[PDB]
């Protein structure tokens, strides 16, 4: 089997991407944030505290003839941005782009933190990291990809995120029309439960490539590119007026600037992020200070190849017995 679903930016900045997901019988379609940095499929639901729902579409398990409460199971998750959610668990039928998994754990939110409430466009998350990170207790549950893998034509999914435009998540096949050149594969460590790999270096604009190993995670659920402070300083030093602002929380730059591109290495290959992809717009409405799309990871503990980086590539998440990642230009 295979599946193919379109993923759409939630706003004009590509702050996140939503993909429609069918849950239950008859289908209830929710727009979920596919997140290769976490491993829980959780949804706003009929059980979510009413004051914490503000425009989202909810899953109502009582209207699904295939929903079954997973007795005794609870979940609770916190994300790198400080947001969180928790609740109980059902199993139900879940389909993405024509690919169907029965008995998928659907984690029903009883509580969500304010940033989730405040974002009416995201009805939940669909985790695509490794199932060892799944938070369900006392019986850990598998991700949608893990459950589907055996049935897929090939044990892979691909992320093809658009810049200011829709893109595609495919399951079980590699669309050879969706990228240019060849796909360069690189080793993955699953020791932290992430799609963790080592970039071979970087370049700023037309500058010379610096060969240096940068360990990080391919995380569709993170908006920006978070890299070591040395790398980020080298980038922003090429933008007149750019500075790190403790009050804003990162590098800002004059909105009148033209940003240089940023290149990252994948083995001997190179992925070029155009400068425009690094512009996240005014820090507040009407400001002439703009927020940068490349930020320091120094306070995180891990480097994160988020959407800014991933949307410059066609990305293969290869879930073979030894997982690997593939990157191609497009």
PDB file of C-alpha atoms in Angstrom:
ATOM      1  CA  UNK A   1       0.000   0.000   0.000  1.00  0.00           C
ATOM      2  CA  UNK A   2       0.818   3.698  -0.238  1.00  0.00           C
ATOM      3  CA  UNK A   3      -0.630   7.025   0.826  1.00  0.00           C
ATOM      4  CA  UNK A   4      -0.228  10.583  -0.412  1.00  0.00           C
ATOM      5  CA  UNK A   5      -1.571  13.705   1.289  1.00  0.00           C
ATOM      6  CA  UNK A   6      -1.124  17.406   0.665  1.00  0.00           C
ATOM      7  CA  UNK A   7       0.313  19.488   3.497  1.00  0.00           C
ATOM      8  CA  UNK A   8      -0.554  23.193   3.668  1.00  0.00           C
ATOM      9  CA  UNK A   9       1.063  26.104   5.555  1.00  0.00           C
ATOM     10  CA  UNK A  10      -1.140  27.402   8.352  1.00  0.00           C
ATOM     11  CA  UNK A  11      -0.246  31.037   7.663  1.00  0.00           C
ATOM     12  CA  UNK A  12       1.726  33.335   5.373  1.00  0.00           C
ATOM     13  CA  UNK A  13       4.994  32.640   7.245  1.00  0.00           C
ATOM     14  CA  UNK A  14       4.935  28.827   7.050  1.00  0.00           C
ATOM     15  CA  UNK A  15       4.878  28.691  10.856  1.00  0.00           C
ATOM     16  CA  UNK A  16       3.604  25.103  10.584  1.00  0.00           C
ATOM     17  CA  UNK A  17       1.926  22.771   8.102  1.00  0.00           C
ATOM     18  CA  UNK A  18      -1.378  20.915   8.426  1.00  0.00           C
ATOM     19  CA  UNK A  19      -2.343  17.689   6.693  1.00  0.00           C
ATOM     20  CA  UNK A  20      -5.890  16.269   6.641  1.00  0.00           C
ATOM     21  CA  UNK A  21      -6.337  12.982   8.500  1.00  0.00           C
ATOM     22  CA  UNK A  22      -9.441  10.770   8.577  1.00  0.00           C
ATOM     23  CA  UNK A  23     -10.241   9.302  12.003  1.00  0.00           C
ATOM     24  CA  UNK A  24     -13.067   6.945  12.854  1.00  0.00           C
ATOM     25  CA  UNK A  25     -16.152   5.565  11.150  1.00  0.00           C
ATOM     26  CA  UNK A  26     -17.755   7.509   9.573  1.00  0.00           C
ATOM     27  CA  UNK A  27     -14.609   9.520   8.954  1.00  0.00           C
ATOM     28  CA  UNK A  28     -13.939  12.621  11.012  1.00  0.00           C
ATOM     29  CA  UNK A  29     -11.364  14.745   9.183  1.00  0.00           C
ATOM     30  CA  UNK A  30      -8.943  16.715  11.360  1.00  0.00           C
ATOM     31  CA  UNK A  31      -6.008  18.822  10.183  1.00  0.00           C
ATOM     32  CA  UNK A  32      -2.946  17.578  12.032  1.00  0.00           C
ATOM     33  CA  UNK A  33       0.608  18.843  12.317  1.00  0.00           C
ATOM     34  CA  UNK A  34       2.843  16.008  11.107  1.00  0.00           C
ATOM     35  CA  UNK A  35       5.800  16.059  13.478  1.00  0.00           C
ATOM     36  CA  UNK A  36       8.926  13.990  12.821  1.00  0.00           C
ATOM     37  CA  UNK A  37      10.197  15.243  16.204  1.00  0.00           C
ATOM     38  CA  UNK A  38       7.602  13.473  18.368  1.00  0.00           C
ATOM     39  CA  UNK A  39       5.751  10.196  18.486  1.00  0.00           C
ATOM     40  CA  UNK A  40       2.191  10.841  19.737  1.00  0.00           C
ATOM     41  CA  UNK A  41      -0.892  11.150  17.561  1.00  0.00           C
ATOM     42  CA  UNK A  42      -3.136  13.377  19.672  1.00  0.00           C
ATOM     43  CA  UNK A  43      -6.247  15.376  18.836  1.00  0.00           C
ATOM     44  CA  UNK A  44      -8.561  18.001  20.169  1.00  0.00           C
ATOM     45  CA  UNK A  45     -11.673  16.087  21.129  1.00  0.00           C
ATOM     46  CA  UNK A  46     -15.090  16.088  22.750  1.00  0.00           C
ATOM     47  CA  UNK A  47     -13.181  15.487  26.007  1.00  0.00           C
ATOM     48  CA  UNK A  48     -11.012  18.609  25.757  1.00  0.00           C
ATOM     49  CA  UNK A  49     -11.774  21.197  28.449  1.00  0.00           C
ATOM     50  CA  UNK A  50     -14.254  23.459  26.679  1.00  0.00           C
ATOM     51  CA  UNK A  51     -12.490  26.712  27.614  1.00  0.00           C
ATOM     52  CA  UNK A  52      -9.336  25.364  25.912  1.00  0.00           C
ATOM     53  CA  UNK A  53     -11.033  24.804  22.536  1.00  0.00           C
ATOM     54  CA  UNK A  54     -11.192  27.912  20.290  1.00  0.00           C
ATOM     55  CA  UNK A  55     -12.059  27.039  16.695  1.00  0.00           C
ATOM     56  CA  UNK A  56     -10.391  23.648  16.309  1.00  0.00           C
ATOM     57  CA  UNK A  57     -12.176  20.680  14.827  1.00  0.00           C
ATOM     58  CA  UNK A  58     -12.649  17.983  17.459  1.00  0.00           C
ATOM     59  CA  UNK A  59     -12.677  14.193  17.361  1.00  0.00           C
ATOM     60  CA  UNK A  60     -15.772  12.767  19.062  1.00  0.00           C
ATOM     61  CA  UNK A  61     -15.054   9.085  19.740  1.00  0.00           C
ATOM     62  CA  UNK A  62     -18.665   8.374  20.727  1.00  0.00           C
ATOM     63  CA  UNK A  63     -19.720   9.075  17.109  1.00  0.00           C
ATOM     64  CA  UNK A  64     -17.191   6.554  15.720  1.00  0.00           C
ATOM     65  CA  UNK A  65     -18.393   2.964  15.492  1.00  0.00           C
ATOM     66  CA  UNK A  66     -14.757   1.734  15.371  1.00  0.00           C
ATOM     67  CA  UNK A  67     -13.495   3.700  18.399  1.00  0.00           C
ATOM     68  CA  UNK A  68     -12.586   1.702  21.507  1.00  0.00           C
ATOM     69  CA  UNK A  69     -11.305   3.147  24.750  1.00  0.00           C
ATOM     70  CA  UNK A  70      -7.819   1.852  25.528  1.00  0.00           C
ATOM     71  CA  UNK A  71      -8.638   1.096  29.132  1.00  0.00           C
ATOM     72  CA  UNK A  72      -6.348   2.659  31.706  1.00  0.00           C
ATOM     73  CA  UNK A  73      -4.141   4.400  29.162  1.00  0.00           C
ATOM     74  CA  UNK A  74      -3.137   8.040  29.635  1.00  0.00           C
ATOM     75  CA  UNK A  75      -0.669  10.321  27.891  1.00  0.00           C
ATOM     76  CA  UNK A  76       1.105  13.564  28.645  1.00  0.00           C
ATOM     77  CA  UNK A  77       3.619  15.407  26.491  1.00  0.00           C
ATOM     78  CA  UNK A  78       5.654  18.593  26.600  1.00  0.00           C
ATOM     79  CA  UNK A  79       7.295  20.133  23.560  1.00  0.00           C
ATOM     80  CA  UNK A  80      10.478  22.122  23.096  1.00  0.00           C
ATOM     81  CA  UNK A  81       8.501  25.358  22.822  1.00  0.00           C
ATOM     82  CA  UNK A  82       7.080  24.855  26.321  1.00  0.00           C
ATOM     83  CA  UNK A  83       3.634  23.780  25.108  1.00  0.00           C
ATOM     84  CA  UNK A  84       1.914  20.653  26.402  1.00  0.00           C
ATOM     85  CA  UNK A  85      -1.164  18.444  26.284  1.00  0.00           C
ATOM     86  CA  UNK A  86      -2.515  15.335  27.986  1.00  0.00           C
ATOM     87  CA  UNK A  87      -5.494  13.023  28.145  1.00  0.00           C
ATOM     88  CA  UNK A  88      -6.705   9.475  27.543  1.00  0.00           C
ATOM     89  CA  UNK A  89      -6.526   7.091  24.597  1.00  0.00           C
ATOM     90  CA  UNK A  90      -8.769   5.378  22.079  1.00  0.00           C
ATOM     91  CA  UNK A  91      -7.920   3.024  19.274  1.00  0.00           C
ATOM     92  CA  UNK A  92      -9.610   3.774  15.970  1.00  0.00           C
ATOM     93  CA  UNK A  93      -9.161   3.624  12.221  1.00  0.00           C
ATOM     94  CA  UNK A  94      -6.876   6.363  10.878  1.00  0.00           C
ATOM     95  CA  UNK A  95      -6.292   7.115   7.199  1.00  0.00           C
ATOM     96  CA  UNK A  96      -3.797   9.496   5.605  1.00  0.00           C
ATOM     97  CA  UNK A  97      -3.971  10.144   1.882  1.00  0.00           C
ATOM     98  CA  UNK A  98      -5.627   6.803   1.169  1.00  0.00           C
ATOM     99  CA  UNK A  99      -3.433   4.724   3.524  1.00  0.00           C
ATOM    100  CA  UNK A 100      -5.427   3.142   6.343  1.00  0.00           C
ATOM    101  CA  UNK A 101      -4.286   1.825   9.731  1.00  0.00           C
ATOM    102  CA  UNK A 102      -6.750   0.027  11.961  1.00  0.00           C
ATOM    103  CA  UNK A 103      -6.259  -0.009  15.720  1.00  0.00           C
ATOM    104  CA  UNK A 104      -4.195   3.191  15.739  1.00  0.00           C
ATOM    105  CA  UNK A 105      -3.785   4.818  19.129  1.00  0.00           C
ATOM    106  CA  UNK A 106      -5.602   8.165  18.963  1.00  0.00           C
ATOM    107  CA  UNK A 107      -4.694  10.192  22.031  1.00  0.00           C
ATOM    108  CA  UNK A 108      -7.643  12.326  23.064  1.00  0.00           C
ATOM    109  CA  UNK A 109      -6.717  15.604  24.740  1.00  0.00           C
ATOM    110  CA  UNK A 110      -8.387  16.459  28.019  1.00  0.00           C
ATOM    111  CA  UNK A 111      -6.067  19.452  28.509  1.00  0.00           C
ATOM    112  CA  UNK A 112      -3.989  21.551  26.124  1.00  0.00           C
ATOM    113  CA  UNK A 113      -1.721  24.494  26.862  1.00  0.00           C
ATOM    114  CA  UNK A 114      -2.525  28.009  25.752  1.00  0.00           C
ATOM    115  CA  UNK A 115      -0.504  28.006  22.528  1.00  0.00           C
ATOM    116  CA  UNK A 116      -2.544  25.079  21.217  1.00  0.00           C
ATOM    117  CA  UNK A 117      -5.841  26.746  22.136  1.00  0.00           C
ATOM    118  CA  UNK A 118      -4.681  29.965  20.511  1.00  0.00           C
ATOM    119  CA  UNK A 119      -3.939  28.255  17.176  1.00  0.00           C
ATOM    120  CA  UNK A 120      -7.316  27.466  15.630  1.00  0.00           C
ATOM    121  CA  UNK A 121      -5.731  25.903  12.529  1.00  0.00           C
ATOM    122  CA  UNK A 122      -4.096  22.863  14.188  1.00  0.00           C
ATOM    123  CA  UNK A 123      -6.455  20.133  15.405  1.00  0.00           C
ATOM    124  CA  UNK A 124      -3.670  17.963  16.856  1.00  0.00           C
ATOM    125  CA  UNK A 125      -0.330  16.373  16.064  1.00  0.00           C
ATOM    126  CA  UNK A 126       0.664  13.184  14.213  1.00  0.00           C
ATOM    127  CA  UNK A 127       4.047  12.054  15.454  1.00  0.00           C
ATOM    128  CA  UNK A 128       6.531  10.469  13.052  1.00  0.00           C
ATOM    129  CA  UNK A 129       9.621  10.066  15.252  1.00  0.00           C
ATOM    130  CA  UNK A 130      10.426   6.638  16.655  1.00  0.00           C
ATOM    131  CA  UNK A 131       7.822   4.897  18.809  1.00  0.00           C
ATOM    132  CA  UNK A 132      10.228   4.706  21.749  1.00  0.00           C
ATOM    133  CA  UNK A 133       9.306   8.374  22.414  1.00  0.00           C
ATOM    134  CA  UNK A 134       5.554   7.700  22.610  1.00  0.00           C
ATOM    135  CA  UNK A 135       4.183   8.916  25.939  1.00  0.00           C
ATOM    136  CA  UNK A 136       1.227   6.552  26.443  1.00  0.00           C
ATOM    137  CA  UNK A 137       1.285   4.831  29.817  1.00  0.00           C
ATOM    138  CA  UNK A 138       1.328   2.102  31.022  1.00  0.00           C
ATOM    139  CA  UNK A 139       1.512   0.517  27.538  1.00  0.00           C
ATOM    140  CA  UNK A 140       3.508   2.534  25.024  1.00  0.00           C
ATOM    141  CA  UNK A 141       1.852   2.846  21.618  1.00  0.00           C
ATOM    142  CA  UNK A 142       3.163   2.833  18.054  1.00  0.00           C
ATOM    143  CA  UNK A 143       3.160   5.718  15.615  1.00  0.00           C
ATOM    144  CA  UNK A 144       1.004   5.724  12.490  1.00  0.00           C
ATOM    145  CA  UNK A 145       4.114   5.026  10.388  1.00  0.00           C
ATOM    146  CA  UNK A 146       5.219   2.152  12.598  1.00  0.00           C
ATOM    147  CA  UNK A 147       1.767   0.576  12.375  1.00  0.00           C
ATOM    148  CA  UNK A 148       1.581   1.030   8.603  1.00  0.00           C
ATOM    149  CA  UNK A 149       5.172   0.053   7.790  1.00  0.00           C
ATOM    150  CA  UNK A 150       4.689  -3.660   7.153  1.00  0.00           C
ATOM    151  CA  UNK A 151       1.871  -2.962   4.686  1.00  0.00           C
ATOM    152  CA  UNK A 152       3.717  -0.250   2.748  1.00  0.00           C
ATOM    153  CA  UNK A 153       5.267  -1.025  -0.624  1.00  0.00           C
ATOM    154  CA  UNK A 154       8.538   0.336   0.801  1.00  0.00           C
ATOM    155  CA  UNK A 155       9.109   1.164   4.516  1.00  0.00           C
ATOM    156  CA  UNK A 156       9.515   4.908   3.952  1.00  0.00           C
ATOM    157  CA  UNK A 157       7.752   8.220   4.118  1.00  0.00           C
ATOM    158  CA  UNK A 158       8.799  11.459   2.438  1.00  0.00           C
ATOM    159  CA  UNK A 159       8.365  15.106   3.353  1.00  0.00           C
ATOM    160  CA  UNK A 160       8.176  17.667   0.539  1.00  0.00           C
ATOM    161  CA  UNK A 161       7.293  20.913   2.295  1.00  0.00           C
ATOM    162  CA  UNK A 162       6.512  23.995   0.260  1.00  0.00           C
ATOM    163  CA  UNK A 163       7.798  27.534   0.639  1.00  0.00           C
ATOM    164  CA  UNK A 164       4.716  29.712   0.976  1.00  0.00           C
ATOM    165  CA  UNK A 165       2.892  26.920  -0.858  1.00  0.00           C
ATOM    166  CA  UNK A 166       1.408  23.456  -0.307  1.00  0.00           C
ATOM    167  CA  UNK A 167       3.551  20.330  -0.414  1.00  0.00           C
ATOM    168  CA  UNK A 168       3.194  16.599   0.115  1.00  0.00           C
ATOM    169  CA  UNK A 169       3.701  13.765   2.579  1.00  0.00           C
ATOM    170  CA  UNK A 170       3.966  10.382   0.847  1.00  0.00           C
ATOM    171  CA  UNK A 171       3.970   6.989   2.556  1.00  0.00           C
ATOM    172  CA  UNK A 172       5.407   3.833   1.072  1.00  0.00           C
ATOM    173  CA  UNK A 173       6.975   5.187  -2.123  1.00  0.00           C
ATOM    174  CA  UNK A 174       9.477   7.727  -3.435  1.00  0.00           C
ATOM    175  CA  UNK A 175       8.037  10.047  -6.116  1.00  0.00           C
ATOM    176  CA  UNK A 176      10.978  10.317  -8.510  1.00  0.00           C
ATOM    177  CA  UNK A 177       9.306  13.320 -10.207  1.00  0.00           C
ATOM    178  CA  UNK A 178       9.347  15.390  -6.999  1.00  0.00           C
ATOM    179  CA  UNK A 179      13.089  16.147  -6.843  1.00  0.00           C
ATOM    180  CA  UNK A 180      16.045  17.012  -9.056  1.00  0.00           C
ATOM    181  CA  UNK A 181      19.333  15.182  -9.213  1.00  0.00           C
ATOM    182  CA  UNK A 182      19.889  12.222  -6.902  1.00  0.00           C
ATOM    183  CA  UNK A 183      18.920  11.544  -3.287  1.00  0.00           C
ATOM    184  CA  UNK A 184      21.885  11.466  -0.913  1.00  0.00           C
ATOM    185  CA  UNK A 185      21.386   9.129   2.018  1.00  0.00           C
ATOM    186  CA  UNK A 186      23.016   9.641   5.400  1.00  0.00           C
ATOM    187  CA  UNK A 187      23.182   7.632   8.598  1.00  0.00           C
ATOM    188  CA  UNK A 188      20.647   7.977  11.413  1.00  0.00           C
ATOM    189  CA  UNK A 189      21.016   7.397  15.138  1.00  0.00           C
ATOM    190  CA  UNK A 190      17.798   6.341  16.866  1.00  0.00           C
ATOM    191  CA  UNK A 191      19.387   6.471  20.340  1.00  0.00           C
ATOM    192  CA  UNK A 192      17.366   9.558  21.340  1.00  0.00           C
ATOM    193  CA  UNK A 193      14.248   8.453  19.439  1.00  0.00           C
ATOM    194  CA  UNK A 194      14.685  11.128  16.746  1.00  0.00           C
ATOM    195  CA  UNK A 195      15.677  11.160  13.077  1.00  0.00           C
ATOM    196  CA  UNK A 196      19.137  12.243  14.195  1.00  0.00           C
ATOM    197  CA  UNK A 197      21.908  12.667  11.621  1.00  0.00           C
ATOM    198  CA  UNK A 198      25.174  14.542  11.081  1.00  0.00           C
ATOM    199  CA  UNK A 199      25.454  17.309   8.516  1.00  0.00           C
ATOM    200  CA  UNK A 200      28.867  17.672   6.912  1.00  0.00           C
ATOM    201  CA  UNK A 201      29.051  21.476   7.138  1.00  0.00           C
ATOM    202  CA  UNK A 202      27.674  24.750   5.890  1.00  0.00           C
ATOM    203  CA  UNK A 203      28.150  27.831   3.741  1.00  0.00           C
ATOM    204  CA  UNK A 204      26.754  31.354   4.052  1.00  0.00           C
ATOM    205  CA  UNK A 205      25.674  32.933   0.786  1.00  0.00           C
ATOM    206  CA  UNK A 206      28.345  32.593  -1.884  1.00  0.00           C
ATOM    207  CA  UNK A 207      30.987  31.907   0.768  1.00  0.00           C
ATOM    208  CA  UNK A 208      33.247  28.900   0.937  1.00  0.00           C
ATOM    209  CA  UNK A 209      31.913  25.701   2.450  1.00  0.00           C
ATOM    210  CA  UNK A 210      33.071  24.954   5.990  1.00  0.00           C
ATOM    211  CA  UNK A 211      33.531  21.240   6.584  1.00  0.00           C
ATOM    212  CA  UNK A 212      32.378  20.505  10.119  1.00  0.00           C
ATOM    213  CA  UNK A 213      30.125  17.854  11.643  1.00  0.00           C
ATOM    214  CA  UNK A 214      26.780  19.155  12.921  1.00  0.00           C
ATOM    215  CA  UNK A 215      24.653  16.551  14.705  1.00  0.00           C
ATOM    216  CA  UNK A 216      20.963  17.390  14.611  1.00  0.00           C
ATOM    217  CA  UNK A 217      17.424  16.144  14.066  1.00  0.00           C
ATOM    218  CA  UNK A 218      15.132  16.342  11.048  1.00  0.00           C
ATOM    219  CA  UNK A 219      12.041  17.833  12.690  1.00  0.00           C
ATOM    220  CA  UNK A 220       9.030  18.795  10.573  1.00  0.00           C
ATOM    221  CA  UNK A 221       7.324  19.973  13.780  1.00  0.00           C
ATOM    222  CA  UNK A 222       9.810  22.794  14.411  1.00  0.00           C
ATOM    223  CA  UNK A 223       9.474  25.960  12.322  1.00  0.00           C
ATOM    224  CA  UNK A 224      13.037  27.263  12.264  1.00  0.00           C
ATOM    225  CA  UNK A 225      16.602  26.034  11.792  1.00  0.00           C
ATOM    226  CA  UNK A 226      18.483  25.851  15.119  1.00  0.00           C
ATOM    227  CA  UNK A 227      22.260  25.498  14.840  1.00  0.00           C
ATOM    228  CA  UNK A 228      25.361  26.075  17.004  1.00  0.00           C
ATOM    229  CA  UNK A 229      26.003  29.678  18.040  1.00  0.00           C
ATOM    230  CA  UNK A 230      29.214  29.831  15.982  1.00  0.00           C
ATOM    231  CA  UNK A 231      27.364  28.910  12.773  1.00  0.00           C
ATOM    232  CA  UNK A 232      24.447  31.253  13.443  1.00  0.00           C
ATOM    233  CA  UNK A 233      26.773  34.170  14.228  1.00  0.00           C
ATOM    234  CA  UNK A 234      28.650  33.574  10.955  1.00  0.00           C
ATOM    235  CA  UNK A 235      25.324  33.711   9.092  1.00  0.00           C
ATOM    236  CA  UNK A 236      23.928  36.885  10.675  1.00  0.00           C
ATOM    237  CA  UNK A 237      27.271  38.689  10.434  1.00  0.00           C
ATOM    238  CA  UNK A 238      26.565  38.862   6.686  1.00  0.00           C
ATOM    239  CA  UNK A 239      23.345  40.860   7.224  1.00  0.00           C
ATOM    240  CA  UNK A 240      23.847  44.562   7.950  1.00  0.00           C
ATOM    241  CA  UNK A 241      22.116  45.555  11.160  1.00  0.00           C
ATOM    242  CA  UNK A 242      21.325  42.015  12.308  1.00  0.00           C
ATOM    243  CA  UNK A 243      21.686  41.373  16.022  1.00  0.00           C
ATOM    244  CA  UNK A 244      20.723  38.909  18.719  1.00  0.00           C
ATOM    245  CA  UNK A 245      17.982  40.417  20.881  1.00  0.00           C
ATOM    246  CA  UNK A 246      17.461  38.932  24.324  1.00  0.00           C
ATOM    247  CA  UNK A 247      14.181  40.858  24.599  1.00  0.00           C
ATOM    248  CA  UNK A 248      12.783  39.415  21.370  1.00  0.00           C
ATOM    249  CA  UNK A 249      14.352  35.982  21.919  1.00  0.00           C
ATOM    250  CA  UNK A 250      16.745  35.568  19.006  1.00  0.00           C
ATOM    251  CA  UNK A 251      18.362  37.136  16.000  1.00  0.00           C
ATOM    252  CA  UNK A 252      16.474  39.981  14.338  1.00  0.00           C
ATOM    253  CA  UNK A 253      17.403  41.934  11.224  1.00  0.00           C
ATOM    254  CA  UNK A 254      16.218  45.029   9.348  1.00  0.00           C
ATOM    255  CA  UNK A 255      13.121  44.146   7.317  1.00  0.00           C
ATOM    256  CA  UNK A 256      14.708  46.124   4.462  1.00  0.00           C
ATOM    257  CA  UNK A 257      17.533  43.566   4.170  1.00  0.00           C
ATOM    258  CA  UNK A 258      18.077  41.037   1.417  1.00  0.00           C
ATOM    259  CA  UNK A 259      19.104  37.837   3.179  1.00  0.00           C
ATOM    260  CA  UNK A 260      21.878  35.540   1.948  1.00  0.00           C
ATOM    261  CA  UNK A 261      21.253  31.884   1.296  1.00  0.00           C
ATOM    262  CA  UNK A 262      22.424  29.183   3.705  1.00  0.00           C
ATOM    263  CA  UNK A 263      23.862  25.873   2.487  1.00  0.00           C
ATOM    264  CA  UNK A 264      24.043  22.690   4.590  1.00  0.00           C
ATOM    265  CA  UNK A 265      25.964  19.523   3.733  1.00  0.00           C
ATOM    266  CA  UNK A 266      24.509  16.043   3.361  1.00  0.00           C
ATOM    267  CA  UNK A 267      27.509  13.827   2.793  1.00  0.00           C
ATOM    268  CA  UNK A 268      29.181  15.222  -0.320  1.00  0.00           C
ATOM    269  CA  UNK A 269      25.919  16.874  -1.433  1.00  0.00           C
ATOM    270  CA  UNK A 270      24.635  20.361  -0.647  1.00  0.00           C
ATOM    271  CA  UNK A 271      21.149  21.714   0.089  1.00  0.00           C
ATOM    272  CA  UNK A 272      20.716  25.449  -0.503  1.00  0.00           C
ATOM    273  CA  UNK A 273      18.175  27.346   1.601  1.00  0.00           C
ATOM    274  CA  UNK A 274      17.291  30.565  -0.279  1.00  0.00           C
ATOM    275  CA  UNK A 275      17.588  33.759   1.716  1.00  0.00           C
ATOM    276  CA  UNK A 276      13.863  34.456   1.473  1.00  0.00           C
ATOM    277  CA  UNK A 277      13.134  31.235   3.408  1.00  0.00           C
ATOM    278  CA  UNK A 278      14.951  32.749   6.414  1.00  0.00           C
ATOM    279  CA  UNK A 279      12.652  35.816   6.680  1.00  0.00           C
ATOM    280  CA  UNK A 280       9.952  35.357   9.344  1.00  0.00           C
ATOM    281  CA  UNK A 281       8.623  38.864   9.097  1.00  0.00           C
ATOM    282  CA  UNK A 282       8.085  41.701  11.528  1.00  0.00           C
ATOM    283  CA  UNK A 283       8.551  40.868  15.212  1.00  0.00           C
ATOM    284  CA  UNK A 284       5.254  42.666  15.837  1.00  0.00           C
ATOM    285  CA  UNK A 285       2.715  44.093  13.442  1.00  0.00           C
ATOM    286  CA  UNK A 286       4.143  47.148  11.702  1.00  0.00           C
ATOM    287  CA  UNK A 287       7.675  46.762  13.038  1.00  0.00           C
ATOM    288  CA  UNK A 288      10.671  47.240  10.775  1.00  0.00           C
ATOM    289  CA  UNK A 289      12.593  44.621  12.779  1.00  0.00           C
ATOM    290  CA  UNK A 290      12.157  41.153  11.295  1.00  0.00           C
ATOM    291  CA  UNK A 291      12.664  37.765  12.931  1.00  0.00           C
ATOM    292  CA  UNK A 292      15.346  35.443  11.631  1.00  0.00           C
ATOM    293  CA  UNK A 293      14.739  31.882  10.479  1.00  0.00           C
ATOM    294  CA  UNK A 294      18.154  30.621  11.628  1.00  0.00           C
ATOM    295  CA  UNK A 295      18.612  30.755  15.398  1.00  0.00           C
ATOM    296  CA  UNK A 296      21.026  29.430  17.980  1.00  0.00           C
ATOM    297  CA  UNK A 297      20.457  25.981  19.472  1.00  0.00           C
ATOM    298  CA  UNK A 298      22.682  26.823  22.454  1.00  0.00           C
ATOM    299  CA  UNK A 299      19.712  26.822  24.850  1.00  0.00           C
ATOM    300  CA  UNK A 300      18.089  23.677  23.428  1.00  0.00           C
ATOM    301  CA  UNK A 301      20.667  20.924  23.853  1.00  0.00           C
ATOM    302  CA  UNK A 302      20.257  19.688  20.277  1.00  0.00           C
ATOM    303  CA  UNK A 303      20.503  21.148  16.791  1.00  0.00           C
ATOM    304  CA  UNK A 304      17.215  21.124  14.885  1.00  0.00           C
ATOM    305  CA  UNK A 305      16.821  20.965  11.094  1.00  0.00           C
ATOM    306  CA  UNK A 306      13.302  22.356  11.172  1.00  0.00           C
ATOM    307  CA  UNK A 307      11.005  23.463   8.371  1.00  0.00           C
ATOM    308  CA  UNK A 308      13.312  26.281   7.195  1.00  0.00           C
ATOM    309  CA  UNK A 309      15.871  23.630   6.255  1.00  0.00           C
ATOM    310  CA  UNK A 310      13.578  20.754   5.306  1.00  0.00           C
ATOM    311  CA  UNK A 311      11.408  22.743   2.911  1.00  0.00           C
ATOM    312  CA  UNK A 312      14.493  23.383   0.748  1.00  0.00           C
ATOM    313  CA  UNK A 313      14.735  19.623   0.129  1.00  0.00           C
ATOM    314  CA  UNK A 314      12.882  16.473  -0.748  1.00  0.00           C
ATOM    315  CA  UNK A 315      13.418  14.403   2.402  1.00  0.00           C
ATOM    316  CA  UNK A 316      13.227  10.612   2.676  1.00  0.00           C
ATOM    317  CA  UNK A 317      12.584   9.120   6.107  1.00  0.00           C
ATOM    318  CA  UNK A 318      13.726   5.533   5.514  1.00  0.00           C
ATOM    319  CA  UNK A 319      12.330   3.183   8.169  1.00  0.00           C
ATOM    320  CA  UNK A 320      14.184   0.106   7.018  1.00  0.00           C
ATOM    321  CA  UNK A 321      15.667  -2.123   9.719  1.00  0.00           C
ATOM    322  CA  UNK A 322      18.597   0.301   9.807  1.00  0.00           C
ATOM    323  CA  UNK A 323      16.921   3.689   9.311  1.00  0.00           C
ATOM    324  CA  UNK A 324      18.523   6.374   7.164  1.00  0.00           C
ATOM    325  CA  UNK A 325      17.636   9.841   5.911  1.00  0.00           C
ATOM    326  CA  UNK A 326      17.770  10.971   2.300  1.00  0.00           C
ATOM    327  CA  UNK A 327      17.966  14.528   0.967  1.00  0.00           C
ATOM    328  CA  UNK A 328      17.569  15.779  -2.602  1.00  0.00           C
ATOM    329  CA  UNK A 329      17.327  19.221  -4.091  1.00  0.00           C
ATOM    330  CA  UNK A 330      14.036  20.093  -5.772  1.00  0.00           C
TER     331      UNK A 330
END
